[PDB]
Design a protein around this ligand. Structure first.
Ligand code: SRY
Ligand code: K
Ligand code: K
Ligand code: K
Ligand code: K
Ligand code: MG
Ligand code: MG
Ligand code: MG
Ligand code: MG
Ligand code: MG
Ligand code: MG
Ligand code: MG
Ligand code: MG
Ligand code: MG
Ligand code: MG
Ligand code: MG
Ligand code: MG
Ligand code: MG
Ligand code: MG
Ligand code: MG
Ligand code: MG
Ligand code: MG
Ligand code: MG
Ligand code: MG
Ligand code: MG
Ligand code: MG
Ligand code: MG
Ligand code: MG
Ligand code: MG
Lengths: 132, 117, 208, 316
RNA sequence: GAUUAACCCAAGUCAAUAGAAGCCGGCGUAAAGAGUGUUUUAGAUCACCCCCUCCCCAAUAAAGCUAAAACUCACCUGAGUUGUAAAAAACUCCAGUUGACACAAAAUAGACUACGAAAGUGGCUUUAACAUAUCUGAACACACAAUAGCUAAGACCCAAACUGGGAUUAGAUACCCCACUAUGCUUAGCCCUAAACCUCAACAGUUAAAUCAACAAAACUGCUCGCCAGAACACUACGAGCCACAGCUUAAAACUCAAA
RNA sequence: AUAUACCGCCAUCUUCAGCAAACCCUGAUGAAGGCUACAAAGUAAGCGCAAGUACCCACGUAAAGACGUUAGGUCAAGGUGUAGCCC
């Protein structure tokens, strides 16, 4: 049976998110896309280089904001700019958040030669869609 | 008059030898058996025997045995209609005895109680 | 099917609609109003409202076609009809004055009657009784015998005994032999009739 | 336990009513409209511009509706502080369903003492909204059996109103072909234009009111354009059925498809354009003959694991 | 197994062995009501009071009888009859009608439920005839006991182990077909067995209470006799007894398992 | 090396309709079991089916398809537990 991106049923004590509660056949019906660029449009190029940046950015943020990411990243590209939008927990102190914003923005701007901006949206606790 | 059951089954008070040895307890059930399928009666056989007897005499020519064939043909048409009419009508039509499915809804409203409550 | 169950088959009969309201029976009149509400399927390409439409000559054309080549199947049928037509005109000018009254020249009347002379009355069906298959005589239905007549005529012509003869000349020759109750297709019906009358002792194995 | 059914009280819904009204005045300031005359259709239009979502499911897109159309209707508290249920049939479990059967059975007894198209019985799913009670299929049938029994009897005027509540309405679209508007050309000849479709073929047909039975497909005589007789037979069919051959002049232009797909597309176009020059009764006969219906049969796609659309690879 | 730590006892520890604790429980299916009845020595309290299904329906033994079917013979006719999921073999003084004709076996009734100790008994008639005024009471006493079987002399319609033939089958010492014998029957002796099982002892009594593991045919009480104590070895071996000599009855142990 | 330690991605029954938490009752509180609509102990969130959606509609085709089964397949996609090699 199909397994991809599916959270198997449990007693009911497992909390899943909206994105985690929907399988691949809902990606364009009930879900959007976590990355939005033009590489995959008809007649566009550099789809393999925008993809490698996304795989690394999601890992850079997961290891740079450990335990603070409630949900997956939403990467946005507008021309030269790259916008990282994230939902984070409120456990960490704000002082440490501002440090990580200026460190990640600057480091990633010199690495991908592009203006990078990061927009945090803190949430008290991980939003729960339903309990599987 | 339903046959008697006094001194028939092997018991403690009955001194004599048993008369009946039932393998299933003699207690009415709350349902009846489903009606079996009938083998059926073959139709248009006499018309089918006088039509194949004419072929042998006339060496299987369909110009001299025309009358016989119609008997076998007209019969088949009538027999076919009866089969269609009989199957549908019997279940939908209520004649004589009831059907098990409707008769078991009546026996389950008045179940047999071989226990105390 | 891309049609829903609501869709009903269309009626191409052109003289049915023309029927005056005065002739319409109460049951028929009701039907006509009901059809208005119903959805109707689109008429298929095969059948039109022409006066020359023959359902038996269209079904015989579909039973010869190979791979959807209906232009060739129809071409063979019309050539056969024209070959039967030209062969009877040649048998009519060379006949005596009193022999011309019994010579049919309409190829259709020959096609329908020839197929009626090949329709068998009873067939052999294998029934399993006692772990063995017995070819017991069974009454063929009206459709089955109409289908077998067409299948046998096309099998005999397709049979590779005639080395280099075109189908129109073969089908035309077999249709004229069956019209006079002659030929293998008629003989094939007798052989099925001789085996159903010899094995009539096993006419009780069947139930239906 | 972590999973609890989201229960919404009257005080919570009352605070949601105030946030929508205030949000309704903010959305009108963004778009520059008048707050007072700002309906719900404009909110749906403004939320689709400000929050453009291409999700196929319309229930998964942003929505800013009134809290009474979002939150579901909930069974209200069924007892006071003392604990006595208001209704006398509370302990049945279906006090709303049984109060209706008790009322209907009470009106059928009075009748004994003193003594249609376009409408359908309320469906099961619509009857659980009037009562806010889950109902089985069998219970719904029992209720319908009493209403029908009510109708057969000589019901009074009041009873008719009662039954009417449970009778929903169905809009039936008259199966009548839409006549095309007869136009006039520069010379003054009357005609009607229509379009047809068959498989991948699309056709436009112009049918002149008076003609000598001349048809030009793409500027070519039909017999030249259609060599195969079958194709010509399809062209004749519409006119032969309405017994008016050799009376109109047709000028069509078919594009796409193949030999047999183009004729079918023209047949349907001529037939639709020939309905403007025939009586209503004749147009219904054409419809019943399958001359005004678009054949929906189109090629079926092939599946990744099979040889064809439905054919399967040989089973080893 | 070594090592470390720990537990128990402790100048002891604890491996082998032996012993100490064994009857008031059961017997429809778990091991047990041993085929039936009688009595003895004796035991019981259901024996006096005190009471209610005599006789008759298929008990038994003897003698006699015969309706239906069959065999055989004879006449007449026919050329085949048998066999079956389908064949072969077999038979052809064969088959069908009619008539004559049993030491065999006893439709319907019987939807009855009787007799008798049980076994068992279901065609007709006749004779003789069916223990006991308390209960219980035996592997062995006394007397019975289906079928099968032995010995001897008769009978013989049919059926039929064995055997022979035909077929099936990988094979077929079987199932299917045919034929025939011992045998089944009578008389006279023997044998003494059964899933002889209504697997539910005899007598008396109760229907209340905790109804009662389960299933089966509700659960109990009194009294007595008989039997039984893990499985298998074992319806065995030995011994004894017996008209039984490949027999029956009675009936162990060793080895073995930790289950049945 | 081990798919008989696994994740991951699948096959299959599935061209299925089950699945199930939490309660309740029955059976003397045994394993177990749980329906009758003129209704007799079942109620049920959740998963699935269904519905929605995609494609040319209401049709059809895709997709979807639970829990389980076969220690099914793959350590050779990659990753990885354990054991092993390290001139
Ligand atoms: C609870 N134990 C059950 C029992 O196991 C037993 C079983 O015991 C067996 C004996 O060794 C053997 O000599 C004995 N063999 C004989 N010829 N007597 C077996 O019959 C015996 N099995 C048995 N009674 N079920 O095998 C042994 C090794 C065992 O594991 C000992 O405890 O029997 C086994 C089945 O035989 C089951 O599988 C086990 O669950
Ligand atoms: K018994
Ligand atoms: K796996
Ligand atoms: K590995
Ligand atoms: K791997
Ligand atoms: Mg039994
Ligand atoms: Mg193909
Ligand atoms: Mg026992
Ligand atoms: Mg006994
Ligand atoms: Mg014994
Ligand atoms: Mg008799
Ligand atoms: Mg005594
Ligand atoms: Mg003794
Ligand atoms: Mg004995
Ligand atoms: Mg004896
Ligand atoms: Mg003897
Ligand atoms: Mg004999
Ligand atoms: Mg032999
Ligand atoms: Mg003899
Ligand atoms: Mg006996
Ligand atoms: Mg005794
Ligand atoms: Mg023992
Ligand atoms: Mg013995
Ligand atoms: Mg012995
Ligand atoms: Mg001895
Ligand atoms: Mg595996
Ligand atoms: Mg659909
Ligand atoms: Mg699929
Ligand atoms: Mg679906």
């Amino acid at each position: 049976k199909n397994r991809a991106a599916r959270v198997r049923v449990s007693k009911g004590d497992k909390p899943v998110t909206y994105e985690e509660a929907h399988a691949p056949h809902y990606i364009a019906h009930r879900k959007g896309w976590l990355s939005l660029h033009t590489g995959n449009l008809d007649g566009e190029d550099h789809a393999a280089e925008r993809t490698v940046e996304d795989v690394f950015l999601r890992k850079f943020m997961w290891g740079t904001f450990p335990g603070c990411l409630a949900d997956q990243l939403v990467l946005k590209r507008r021309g030269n700019q790259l916008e990282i939008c994230a939902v984070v927990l409120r456990q960490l102190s704000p002082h440490k958040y501002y440090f990580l914003v200026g460190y990640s923005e600057t480091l990633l701007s010199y690495f991908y030669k592009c203006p990078v901006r990061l927009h945090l949206q803190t949430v008290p606790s991980k939003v729960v869609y339903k309990y599987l | 008059a339903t046959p008697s059951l006094r001194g028939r089954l092997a018991r403690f008070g009955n001194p004599r030898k048993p008369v009946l040895k039932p393998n299933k307890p003699l207690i009415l059930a709350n349902r009846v058996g489903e009606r079996r399928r009938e083998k059926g009666e073959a139709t248009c056989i006499t018309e089918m025997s006088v039509m194949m007897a004419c072929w042998k005499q006339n060496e299987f020519r369909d110009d001299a045995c025309r009358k016989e064939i119609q008997g076998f043909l007209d019969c088949a048409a009538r027999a076919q209609e009866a089969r269609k009419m009989r199957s549908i009508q019997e279940t939908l039509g209520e004649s004589g005895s009831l059907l098990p499915n409707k008769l078991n809804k009546l026996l389950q409203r008045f179940p047999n109680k071989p226990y105390l409550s | 099917s891309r049609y829903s169950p609501e869709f009903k088959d269309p009626l191409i009969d052109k003289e049915y609609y023309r029927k005056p309201v005065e002739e319409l029976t109460e049951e028929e009149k009701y039907v006509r109003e009901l059809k208005k509400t119903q959805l109707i399927k689109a008429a298929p390409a095969g059948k039109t409202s022409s006066v020359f439409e023959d359902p038996v000559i269209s079904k015989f054309t579909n039973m010869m076609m190979i791979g959807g080549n209906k232009v060739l199947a129809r071409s063979l049928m019309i050539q056969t009809l024209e070959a039967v037509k030209r062969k009877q005109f040649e048998k009519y000018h060379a006949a005596s004055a009193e022999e011309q009254a019994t010579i049919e020249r309409n190829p259709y009347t020959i096609f329908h009657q020839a197929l009626k002379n090949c329709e068998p009355m009873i067939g052999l069906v294998p029934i399993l009784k006692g772990g063995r298959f017995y070819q017991v005589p069974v009454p063929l239905p009206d459709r089955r015998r109409r289908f077998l007549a067409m299948k046998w005529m096309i099998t005999e012509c397709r049979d590779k005994k005639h080395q280099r003869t075109l189908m129109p000349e073969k089908l035309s020759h077999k249709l004229l032999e069956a019209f006079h109750n002659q030929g293998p297709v008629i003989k094939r019906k007798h052989d099925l009739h001789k085996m159903a009358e010899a094995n009539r002792a096993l006419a009780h194995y069947r139930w239906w | 336990p972590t999973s609890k059914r989201e229960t919404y009280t009257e005080d919570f819904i009352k605070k949601q009513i105030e946030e929508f009204n205030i949000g309704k005045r903010h959305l009108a300031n963004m778009m520059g409209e008048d707050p007072e005359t700002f309906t719900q259709e404009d909110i749906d239009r403004a939320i689709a511009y400000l929050f453009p979502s291409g999700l196929f499911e319309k229930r998964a897109r942003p929505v800013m509706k009134h809290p009474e159309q979002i939150f579901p209707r909930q069974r209200a508290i069924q007892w006071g502080e003392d604990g006595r249920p208001f209704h006398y049939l509370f302990y049945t479990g279906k006090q709303s369903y049984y109060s209706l059967m008790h009322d209907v059975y009470g009106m059928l007894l009075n009748l004994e003492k003193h003594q249609v198209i376009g409408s359908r019985w309320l469906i099961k799913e619509e009857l659980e909204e009037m009562l806010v009670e889950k109902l089985s299929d069998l219970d719904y049938m029992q209720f319908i059996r009493l209403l029908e029994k009510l109708l057969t009897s000589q019901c009074g005027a009041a009873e008719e109103e009662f039954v009417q509540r449970f009778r929903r309405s169905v809009t039936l679209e008259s199966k009548k072909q839409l006549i095309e508007p007869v136009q006039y050309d520069e010379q003054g000849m009357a005609f009607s234009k229509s379009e047809g479709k068959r498989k991948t073929a699309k056709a436009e047909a112009i049918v002149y009111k008076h003609g000598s039975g001349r048809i030009k497909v793409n500027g070519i005589d039909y017999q030249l354009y259609f060599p195969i007789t079958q194709d010509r037979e399809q062209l004749m069919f519409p006119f032969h059925f309405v017994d008016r051959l050799g009376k109109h002049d047709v000028t069509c232009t078919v594009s796409g498809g193949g030999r047999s797909a183009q004729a079918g597309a023209i047949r349907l176009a001529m037939a639709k354009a020939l309905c403007s020059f025939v009586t209503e009764d004749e147009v219904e006969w054409m419809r019943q003959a399958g001359l005004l219906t678009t054949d929906p049969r189109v090629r079926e796609r092939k599946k990744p694991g099979q040889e064809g659309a439905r054919r399967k690879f040989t089973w080893k």
